[PDB]
């Protein structure tokens, strides 16, 4: 099982937000820690992506682009899995030191987005997603958003995406049950993109608002949210849907 061996081997370990849980649950303090968590996870997403089978076949500029468009969906999908396995879905397990209860969902001013993230987390239980299915679906999310004008070497991207779809098929197969499962998992994958889109809109709006009041985001987050996220929000970069 070479493919699943690799995915299991490179899966990132635990990452803490660095949140001081004895300060009060203010909008400012919670988003400060969420943004730091994202900056810390970005490091792990890059190292994970560069170690995926075939990823280095992509042109170097495409490698960075695909990471810089897919990170929100990757991170939300992983957080949903952590929540499913750690608190069983009525809380959101962003990190061991940053677990959202209903009060923090409200004070962060992200309550509706957290509701949707809780729903995604609960789908891992409703569908009885296996660790192998989770790992292959998460890898596919890296190959599920691209510029409408294409990548520098789109042909290699298309072949790589094809092969990750084949791997998902293989895990399901390892025929009427297979077909239903594949439909369920591809419907689950598609449901990540609208959630990520909402969070992309939110974080852009907050970066603008924070800049107005002279509070800076972490370095890599501020660059990606001002250079790459607006390409998503303006329609120059679009998700690839199955259905
Ligand atoms: C990806 C993160 C941080 C990592 C994670 O577990 C998922 C979570 C989803 C909400 C994101 C957050 C990073 C910081 C963001 C983007 C805030 O600016 C607004 C929404 C937050």
UniProtKB/Swiss-Prot annotation:
<feature type="site" description="Interaction with coactivator LXXL and FXXFY motifs">
    <location>
        <position position="50"/>
    </location>
</feature>
<feature type="site" description="Interaction with coactivator FXXLF and FXXFY motifs">
    <location>
        <position position="223"/>
    </location>
</feature>
<feature type="binding site">
    <location>
        <position position="82"/>
    </location>
    <ligand>
        <name>17beta-hydroxy-5alpha-androstan-3-one</name>
    </ligand>
</feature>
<feature type="region of interest" description="Interaction with CCAR1">
    <location>
        <begin position="1"/>
        <end position="243"/>
    </location>
</feature>
<feature type="region of interest" description="Interaction with LPXN">
    <location>
        <begin position="1"/>
        <end position="243"/>
    </location>
</feature>
<feature type="binding site">
    <location>
        <position position="35"/>
    </location>
    <ligand>
        <name>17beta-hydroxy-5alpha-androstan-3-one</name>
    </ligand>
</feature>
<comment type="similarity">
    <text>Belongs to the nuclear hormone receptor family. NR3 subfamily.</text>
</comment>
<feature type="binding site">
    <location>
        <position position="203"/>
    </location>
    <ligand>
        <name>17beta-hydroxy-5alpha-androstan-3-one</name>
    </ligand>
</feature>
<feature type="domain" description="NR LBD">
    <location>
        <begin position="1"/>
        <end position="225"/>
    </location>
</feature>
<feature type="modified residue" description="Phosphotyrosine; by CSK">
    <location>
        <position position="241"/>
    </location>
</feature>
<feature type="region of interest" description="Interaction with KAT7">
    <location>
        <begin position="1"/>
        <end position="243"/>
    </location>
</feature>
<protein>
    <recommendedName>
        <fullName>Androgen receptor</fullName>
    </recommendedName>
</protein>
<comment type="subunit">
    <text>Binds DNA as a homodimer. Part of a ternary complex containing AR, EFCAB6/DJBP and PARK7. Interacts with HIPK3 and NR0B2 in the presence of androgen. The ligand binding domain interacts with KAT7/HBO1 in the presence of dihydrotestosterone. Interacts with EFCAB6/DJBP, PQBP1, RANBP9, RBAK, SPDEF, SRA1, TGFB1I1 and RREB1. Interacts with ZMIZ1/ZIMP10 and ZMIZ2/ZMIP7 which both enhance its transactivation activity. Interacts with SLC30A9 and RAD54L2/ARIP4. Interacts with MACROD1 (via macro domain).</text>
</comment>
<comment type="function">
    <text>Steroid hormone receptors are ligand-activated transcription factors that regulate eukaryotic gene expression and affect cellular proliferation and differentiation in target tissues. Transcription factor activity is modulated by bound coactivator and corepressor proteins like ZBTB7A that recruits NCOR1 and NCOR2 to the androgen response elements/ARE on target genes, negatively regulating androgen receptor signaling and androgen-induced cell proliferation. Transcription activation is also down-regulated by NR0B2. Activated, but not phosphorylated, by HIPK3 and ZIPK/DAPK3.</text>
</comment>
